[PDB]
Structures are given as C-alpha cells and as structure tokens.
Paper text:
The mycobacterial membrane protein large 3 (MmpL3) transporter is essential and required for shuttling the lipid trehalose monomycolate (TMM), a precursor of mycolic acid (MA)-containing trehalose dimycolate (TDM) and mycolyl arabinogalactan peptidoglycan (mAGP), in Mycobacterium species, including Mycobacterium tuberculosis and Mycobacterium smegmatis. A detailed analysis suggested that MmpL3 is a TMM flippase that is absolutely essential for transporting TMMs across the cell membrane. MmpL3 consists of 12 transmembrane helices (TMs 1 to 12) and 2 periplasmic subdomains (PDs 1 and 2). Our structural data are in line with MD simulations that indicate the major conformational change of the transporter is located at the periplasmic subdomain PD2, where this movement can easily be interpreted as a rigid body rotational motion of PD2 in relation to the PD1 subdomain.
We then reconstituted the delipidated, purified MmpL3 transporter into lipidic nanodiscs. The structure of MmpL3-ND was solved using single-particle cryo-EM. The reconstituted sample led to a cryo-EM map at a nominal resolution of 3.65 Å. Density modification allowed us to improve the resolution of the map to 3.00 Å. The cryo-EM structure of MmpL3-ND indicates a monomeric molecule that spans the inner membrane and protrudes into the periplasm. Overall, the conformation of the cryo-EM structure of MmpL3-ND is comparable to that of the X-ray structure of MmpL3773-PE, although there are some conformational differences between these 2 structures. The conformation of MmpL3-ND is distinct in that the gap between subdomains PD1 and PD2 is larger when compared with that of MmpL3773-PE. The volume of the periplasmic central cavity formed between PD1 and PD2 was measured to be 1,794 Å3 in MmpL3-ND. Based on the structural information, the increased volume of the periplasmic central cavity of MmpL3-ND is in part caused by the increased separation of PD1 and PD2.
Numbering used by the authors: 1 to 346, 385 to 761
The structure:
C-alpha cells in the first residue's frame, strides 16, 4: 500500500513541493510572534474545589494588589532616614516615576506618605535601626499576564531610583525573570547546537548537501509546528515553556528521521538499483517504519490529556503537532526531493559486527547480571517529595533571587501565604458571624496553627476587601498563616470534615491547598495513565509488526529502564548530590514534570527500539534464521542509533545550561535516559535475551494477522526487487 504512495509522490512533485514549502514559509512569518498568546497560568486542576473557590472569592472581593512588586530602598549614603532630605529626594524620584506614566501603575504605598503614624502594621514596616525601608506598589490590570507585560514595560525606571540604589522583588519580578529567560535560553540553544550537529552530520553524510537536507527539514518542521501552535492559540492559550520544548524536540526528531531515510537511500543506491524503484524501496521499508515511530510517539503522550493541567495539555498538543508534522513532511517530500537530487550526490562497522557476534555466541551471564544491576537503581527513588515551583530554584548568582532573600532576611514575617476558608451563601440569607466563631474554634481545637499574640482572638479574620468586590452577604472568608506547609496536608482532610449547620457552604483554598489538590488529582489518574499507555504502546508495536511477544517484553524492559533512569535523576536532584556541580539548590520536584518526562522518554526509547526490531524483522523476513538475521541487524541499526543518540545528546545538553532548574531537570534527565537506553540496550544485553528466547519468539495472533496484513501497513515482504 505504501509503494503506491511513494510512486504517486514520484509522479507529480512540483505541486506538493510548492504547497509544503509555501505553507511552512508562511507559517514562519505567521508565528514570528507566538509569545503574544503564551500564558503562565493553568498549572492546576479546575475539578479541585480549591482553584474554583479561590477564583470565586477573588471575583466577589477583588484582587489583593499588595504583593505585585515591592522595592527595598537604599538611602544616599550615610544620613539617617528620619529627617527631610532623604525622604524628599526619594519621594521626588517616586513622583517622577508616577508622573512619567499614569496608565501603568496605581499608587506607591509607603511609610513616607505618613511617616508620623503609629499603626503597628506600618510601624513594623521599618528596621530596628530604620535605615532599610521598602515601598509596595501594584500594576494596572486584572489578570497576571497583562500586569506582567506592564512590568516588563516600566521596570527600568523603577530600577534607576536613588543616588544609591533600590532592590525590587515580589510576585511579579521573579515571574518576569523566569519567563523572560526562555528567549535567551532558546537563542543560546540554536547558537551552541547548530555547529556541533552540523559538523558531525557533515562528517557522517559526506557532502555539503547531504548535511543540508536534515537541518533544513528540522528547521521547517519546527517552523510549521510553531505555526500550528499559533493557529491553535485562537481558542486555548499555551504555556511559554512550550516554545523551547517544541523548538528543540521537533528539531531532534526531524534530524533523526532525516538520517533515518538518507542513510537507507544511500545504501540502496550504492547497490546500483533503478532510481524510481530505489525511492520506492526507501518509502516501503523506511517510510513505513518512520510512520510507526511517529504514531507511537504521538500516542504515548496523548493519555496526559486525562490530567487537566493547561501546562500538560498545551505541551502534549505541542509534541503531537510537532512530531506528526515532521514525520508526514518527511515521508511526503524527502523522497521526491532526493529523487530530484540525482545519482551524483558526490573500520567501525567491522568491529561492531565482531563484537556483537562474539557477545551473542554466549552472552548468558553477560545478559543476566546486567539487567539486575540497574534494578538496584530502583532503591534511590521512593523518597518522592512535593515542592512545586518556588523561588529557590533560580541560581544564587541571580539578582532577583538574592534581592528577595535580602527582603525576607532584613524584613521577617512581612509576607505570608494564607489559606482561605470561603463561605458563599447559597441561601442568599445574610450571615451572622457567630457560626464563623463556632467554626474557627472548631478548627482551632486541632493543632498546627500560628498565633502572633498567644490569644485565639487574633487569628482567622476577613481578608482585605477592596471596593472592586461584591459587597453582599456572600462570603466572609477567614485566613491563617502556616506552621509548616506540608503538615497542612493532613489538615486538608479534617478541614473538610467539620460542618456548617444548615444552609451555608464552605470551601477551602490557598496556595498550598491548590498545589496539594493538583498533586492529589494527579495521583488519582496515575494507574489509568500508566496501564493504558503501556497496553496501547504494546498493541501498536504489534500492529506495526508481525509479532507481539517480543515487543511486549521489550516494552516491559523499557519500563524497567524508565524506572531506573528516573531513580537516577531523582538521586541527581531530590537527593542533592550534584547541587554544587550544577549550582542549584536541592529542592523538591514538580507535580506533572515527572509524568511528562517519563512519558516522553518512554516514547523516545520505544522509537529507537522500533527500528532495531524492524531491521531484525526485515533481516529475518529476508529468509535467514535467527543468528544471521540478528547478526546483520544489530550493528546495522547501531551505526544509525549511535549518530541519533549523539545528535540528541548534543541538542539536550544545550539545555543543561538554562538557569531554571526544572528545565535543567528535563534536559539532563531525558539525555541521560536516552543514552543509557539506546547504547546499553542495543549494545549488550537485549539482542542477547532475544536470541536466548529463540525462534518461537516470532509468533503472533493469526486472527489478528488477518487484519494486520490487509490494512495496508504490514508491508514486510518485498517482491524480489530487481538489480
């Protein structure tokens, strides 16, 4: 069935070439600016009561703008801040700041407007010696993205304050820095990635043009992917982390597929076959396999849609679009372009073959210990943690992280993240707060709460209610600080165990509650994720091939390898060994990051496996027994897998240098996992265990063989192609 597609591609090439080149070149200018529709929200679960309750409380009261940006002020030099000159100069510069722009900011809340006040809340707003003070200010807007953009617009003028200086931090500055690092990270990515891959693949494919094919293919594939994401941005927003993920993963898989096809065609044309039937051959035995790789890798990540996180949904859409577009463009246009290219395209393989044969003659021992060694690498994991995204992620040399540390060092206890207890009146009958007192006592009798004055009457009062909210008998929420955040986990359960008497409901929110509800929702759909992923991957492996037992055992082996490499990366990060090596603080992990990395590495490792099996199944179907087939297959697939692994390792280590620690986590984990899977799997033990299994390993359901060889994608046998 695939030969007909190859020959009709051969027939009329200009139409497809023009259509695809024009589509990708237009998508490039279409998506020049995709950061217009990127967001930093949607990380959590809507099905959780925490997020919905917090949002309803916010819309009924209005945003608490007190923590957008806060800047600590440093005086001229050595004159105390209790007299006129310092206050006049700093307030005059602040007047400059509010005077230059009005459409951007609301108003600077500070000790200086009313220095001669005795309110303890603003009295503790100064140090004991009173030389370090700060100024709070929000930004104009309603959602976090537009106020972040406003900050990005007007930050440097706030930077320039003082004949000394000012250090500003808070909720908005750290977010702005950690979002804006991505552009420079991507720039560094191509700058430090293109030369190495270019030189290695030039020294591999010989001439300049053969190195020009896959780089162009990857660039156009990622441009089309970003264009498709820009089109998708019409309805559902995407996270800003999607852009680097696509920009590198599409490039890597596209380079691998370009090698995948060009190295096969070159050996096809060295035999001297006819060029039309040559590109036919490249389509039938390589295009079918690359379609298998594409469909399996896209199907590996789609079960993540069961996790309702906008981050996960966005990145899965990104991966799907990027990889499938790359593969379809490859199989459609590369054969035609190579046919137009023409015939004049103008010691390691030997020892690979010798090594694999000598090993496989009796690798019994050389098979069994090895697989159990990494088994022990299971025990480093199991101490999984929960920290989400925090600020100690950023490097110590960063100005913002040290500024925020200086802020909460020289000013203790000024900012705390509360947990809200929202009480929305379904009955629409106005509240009496005697029930509120009853409930606060009811939840006070359980331990684990802070108290600033050893008197219970000083905790759990209403949150600030600016005029933007609905002044109605709707909600009287109560907030409290933290003793220690993780203990609140237990509280969560009992925080829903109590009762409002008759008709008023009660929901529980707050940032730890949002984080923990998200992680609990993730754990809720954990077993379905893994089981459906593995069963569908194995079945689709068999659907690609003529056997099921070898693919399912290979997938289980890949599961063990995934567990081992995830344990290794946990030892790298959660254990903290290597913290000084990579200049990162050992901190707990993220909620969906682990699932993302395990899914993607399952996909990549099973891709490498698919062609390894394909070469060996092609070798077996040529007509030879187990020994000759596997002997000719292992080294032949290894010569390509080594180059692919080197390419992917370079393009991944391009991202072990991004200051954001989670992106380092992703890159380092995926690269070590892909290397430890590819090299070790097809180097030592896996063909060994396959050959110990033997000739019976090539059985499959004939009742399913019926559909397999009649759907048009089980084209293994070849019609004795002429020479």
């Amino acid at each position: 069935m695939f030969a007909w597609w190859g020959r009709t591609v051969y027939q009329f090439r200009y139409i497809v070439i023009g259509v695809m080149v024009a589509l990708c070149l237009g998508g490039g200018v279409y998506g020049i600016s995709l950061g217009n529709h990127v967001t930093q929200s949607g990380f959590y679960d809507e099905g959780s009561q925490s997020v919905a309750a917090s949002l309803i409380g916010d819309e009924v009261y209005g945003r608490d703008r007190t923590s957008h940006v806060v800047a600590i002020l440093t005086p001229p030099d050595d004159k105390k801040v209790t007299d006129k000159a310092w206050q006049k100069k700093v307030t005059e510069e602040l007047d400059q700041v509010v005077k230059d722009h009005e459409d951007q900011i609301v108003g600077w809340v500070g000790w200086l407007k009313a220095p001669d006040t005795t309110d303890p809340t603003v009295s503790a707003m100064k140090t004991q010696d009173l030389r370090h003070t700060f100024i709070s200010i929000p930004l104009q807007g309603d959602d976090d993205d537009e106020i972040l953009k406003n900050y990005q617009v007007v930050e440097p003028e706030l930077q320039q304050v003082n004949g000394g200086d000012i250090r500003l931090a808070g909720l908005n500055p750290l977010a702005s820095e950690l979002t804006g690092t991505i552009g420079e990270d991507q720039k560094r990515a191509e700058v430090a990635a293109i030369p190495l891959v270019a030189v290695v693949l030039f020294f591999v494919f010989g001439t300049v043009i053969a190195a020009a094919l896959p780089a162009i293919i990857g660039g156009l594939a990622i441009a089309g992917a970003l264009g498709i994401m820009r089109l998708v941005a019409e309805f559902t927003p995407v996270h800003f982390f999607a852009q680097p993920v696509v920009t590198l993963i599409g490039l890597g898989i596209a380079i691998d597929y370009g090698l995948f096809i060009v190295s096969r065609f070159r050996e096809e044309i060295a035999e001297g076959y006819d060029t039309e039937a040559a590109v036919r051959r490249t389509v039938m035995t390589s295009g079918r396999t690359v379609v298998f790789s594409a469909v399996i890798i896209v199907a590996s990540s789609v079960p993540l849609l069961l996790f309702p996180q906008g981050f996960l949904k966005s990145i899965t859409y990104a991966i799907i679009a990027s990889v499938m577009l790359a593969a379809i463009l490859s199989i459609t246009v590369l054969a035609a372009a190579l046919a137009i290219l023409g015939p004049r395209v103008d010691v390691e393989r030997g020892f690979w073959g010798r090594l694999v044969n000598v090993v496989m003659k009796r690798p019994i021992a050389f098979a069994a210990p090895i697989l159990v060694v990494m088994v022990l690498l299971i025990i480093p994991l199991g101490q999984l943690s929960l920290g989400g995204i925090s600020e100690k992620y950023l490097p110590p040399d960063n100005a913002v992280r040290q500024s925020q540390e200086q802020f909460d060092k020289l000013f203790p206890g000024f900012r705390t993240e509360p947990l809200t207890l929202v009480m929305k009146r379904e009955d629409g009958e106005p509240i009496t707060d005697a029930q509120i007192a009853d409930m606060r006592a009811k939840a006070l009798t359980v331990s684990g709460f802070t108290d600033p004055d050893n008197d219970p009457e000083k905790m759990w009062k209403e949150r600030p209610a600016n005029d933007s909210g609905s002044k109605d008998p709707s909600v009287r929420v109560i907030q409290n600080g933290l003793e220690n955040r993780n203990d609140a986990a237990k509280k969560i359960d009992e925080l829903r165990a109590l009762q409002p008497p008759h008709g008023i409901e009660v929901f529980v929110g707050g940032t730890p509650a949002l984080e923990q509800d998200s992680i609990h929702s993730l754990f809720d759909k954990l077993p379905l994720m893994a089981l459906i992923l593995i069963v569908t991957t194995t079945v689709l492996m068999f659907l690609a091939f003529g056997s099921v037992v070898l693919p399912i055992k290979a997938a289980l082996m890949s599961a063990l390898t995934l567990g081992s490499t995830m344990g290794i990366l946990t030892w790298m990060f959660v254990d903290g060994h290597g913290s000084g090596l990579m200049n990162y603080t050992p901190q707990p992990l993220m909620a969906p990051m682990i699932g993302l990395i395990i899914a993607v590495i399952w996909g990549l490792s099973t891709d490498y496996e698919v062609f390894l099996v394909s070469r060996m199944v092609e070798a077996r179907e040529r007509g030879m027994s187990t020994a000759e087939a596997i002997r000719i297959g292992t080294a032949t697939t290894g010569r390509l897998i080594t180059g692919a692994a080197l390419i992917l390792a370079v393009v991944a280590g391009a991202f072990v240098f991004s200051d954001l620690v989670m992106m380092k986590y992703l890159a380092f984990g995926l690269l070590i996992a892909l290397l430890l899977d590819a090299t070790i799997i097809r180097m030592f033990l896996v063909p060994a265990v396959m050959k110990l299994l033997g000739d019976d390993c090539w059985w499959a359901p004939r009742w399913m063989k019926r559909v397999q060889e009649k759907l048009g994608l089980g084209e293994t046998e070849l019609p004795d192609e002429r020479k």
